[PDB]
């Protein structure tokens, strides 16, 4: 959604 | 399980690692995400992802999905140590259980119900 996107799990 | 991740970087580096990412961001989970081996769907192009711990199971199918294109007749599966994990569970809640010695929990996907 607005928080859970795919670059939410990218690593930092 | 073979990850090629492991191949790629010694044990003592990636614990390291997953040490300072699980302090630095409690509320996250560090994954490796690999394609079983012969699975016939799209690839990634990184193995090492962060992830929220209350992400869900199906939450990632659905971004997987999106991410490399599976059409609706694609199935996708993920598994944990060879058994796949429940939809509903969160990372955190897999972390907990099956993270390895690391610190990184591994999750495999295939578009097979058996690794
Ligand atoms: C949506 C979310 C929740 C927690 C941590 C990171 C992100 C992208
Ligand atoms: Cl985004």
Known sequence: ?12 | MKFVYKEEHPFEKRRSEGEKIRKKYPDRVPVIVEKAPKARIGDLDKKKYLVPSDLTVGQFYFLIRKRIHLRAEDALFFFVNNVIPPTSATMGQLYQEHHEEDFFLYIAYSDESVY
Do not use: G, H, K
């Open chain 1, 1 to 12: 959604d607005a928080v859970y996107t795919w670059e939410c799990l990218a690593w930092p």
